[PDB]
């Protein structure tokens, strides 16, 4: 049992969710690199989404979300 419990949470912005901002494709659709011939979706603490293939490559340059300069981290 618990008489007293104090917890800590962070409110994050909820996002439209619809379109990869790197391929400018649709998230549910394949990424543009796969379209020319396993392609799945990755998320971030800012709630922005990308295909795995896009954001990974972006990270190899620098570790951030590209939209907001926030440090990049997966869900």
């Amino acid at each position: 049992e618990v008489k007293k419990w104090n917890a800590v949470a962070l409110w994050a912005w909820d996002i439209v969710v619809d379109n990869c901002a790197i391929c400018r494709n649709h998230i549910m659709d394949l990424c543009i690199e796969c379209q020319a011939n396993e392609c799945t979706v990755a998320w971030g603490v800012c709630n922005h989404a990308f295909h795995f293939h896009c954001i990974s490559r972006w990270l190899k340059t620098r570790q951030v979300c590209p939209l907001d300069n926030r440090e990049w981290e997966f869900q």
């Binding site: 790197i22 391929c23 400018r24 543009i32 379209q35 972006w58 340059t61 590209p66 939209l67």
Partner: protein, 169 residues
């Protein structure tokens, strides 16, 4: 030819499409137009900016856009075909614009590039110049920098460099 052997064993058994989306979705200012030599090939094209306001007002400056296969991840190579007296633009026609090199992120578009490109002419900045003499005059004397830019666009000598007339008609 080393790996030639390996290939044989595997023998016996468009990625943009993005620049497409950039161009479809393109929204041009009344000051900016683009050209295509080959309507089939979008990875090469030309941009023309005619500033309606600023020091460069009433002038024609044409830039070339070459889009590598590494797009959006790799930025377009753009250069200024027009000889111009500008701190961020060199007589060699290289352009200093953050979005073009270091601050490039593949969340951006040709639209973006166009806005920054016009922005040079709108807001010319002496900071980290390609042309040091231009940046110096811009720095200390705005009156003279203006007179200079004018003379540079009507055609004429400033220094030992003849600047050729770029005026829009």
């Amino acid at each position: 030819m080393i790996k030639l052997f390996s290939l044989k064993q595997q023998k016996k058994e468009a990625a943009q499409l993005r620049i497409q989306k950039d161009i479809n979705e393109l929204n041009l200012p009344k000051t900016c137009d683009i050209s295509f030599s080959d309507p089939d090939d979008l990875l090469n094209f030309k941009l023309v900016i005619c500033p309606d306001e600023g020091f460069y007002k009433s002038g024609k400056f044409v830039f070339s856009f070459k889009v590598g296969q590494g797009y959006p991840h790799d930025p377009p190579k753009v250069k200024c075909e027009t000889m111009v007296y500008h701190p961020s633009i060199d007589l060699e026609g290289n352009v200093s614009l953050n979005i073009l090199r270091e601050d490039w992120k593949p969340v951006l578009t040709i639209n973006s590039i166009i806005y920054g490109l016009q922005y040079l002419f709108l807001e010319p900045n002496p900071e980290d110049p390609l042309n040091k003499e231009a940046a110096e005059v811009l720095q200390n004397n705005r009156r003279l920098f203006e007179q200079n830019v004018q003379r540079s666009m009507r055609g004429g000598y400033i220094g030992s460099t003849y600047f050729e007339r770029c005026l829009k008609h």
